[PDB]
Amino acid sequence: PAGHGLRSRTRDSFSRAFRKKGTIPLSTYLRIFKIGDYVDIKVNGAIHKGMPHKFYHGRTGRVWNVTKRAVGVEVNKQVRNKILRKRIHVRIEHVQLSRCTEEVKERMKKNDQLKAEAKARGEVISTKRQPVGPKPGFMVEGATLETVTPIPYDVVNDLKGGY
């Protein structure tokens, strides 16, 4: 409405991948969705029912409801000077389980194990990971050195493959 249809400017967004049209693989319908799961919204152009608005395409949200064929997703949306947690319902064909938190549980388990080991030996440690820092000094074995010099200019080589 108001000068723009629901699917305006979706020629590329809602189109299917090259040589990937037709029947949908069964893995899409065999997935399990539960409350609190993070999902990625990817519109399947062949499924016209339960289609999210184009804005939510390419955005990640959290599952808050589970119906027979669709799943409720809460997606942040910036409107002027605030963020709105807009709740939508989307069919499972248009949604994929997100990997944005795949390493969290593993890291927590390893941190707990390390903390328990440190407590056993009576030491205090920090399990926080750190950004890559400066490397220490080291010795590099001498080898044959190849000299690099600027190339004399030749106009005939200005074209790819030569003039």
Binding site: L145, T147, V148, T149, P152, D154
Partner: protein
């Protein structure tokens, strides 16, 4: 001022000679030049031949 200063040698003679040889080799490679043989079209201009 007294000019009675000692003659101190931190490094012995053989290792001093080794250090001098290594430094000379390093300087030689430092001042070394390329053969400039990769530019066949400019061999005459560059003075290679």
């Amino acid at each position: 001022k007294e000019k009675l200063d000692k003659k101190r040698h931190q490094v012995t003679k053989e290792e001093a000679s080794a250090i001098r040889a290594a430094g000379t080799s390093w300087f030689k490679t430092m001042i070394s030049d390329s053969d400039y043989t990769e530019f066949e079209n400019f061999t005459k201009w560059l003075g290679v031949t």
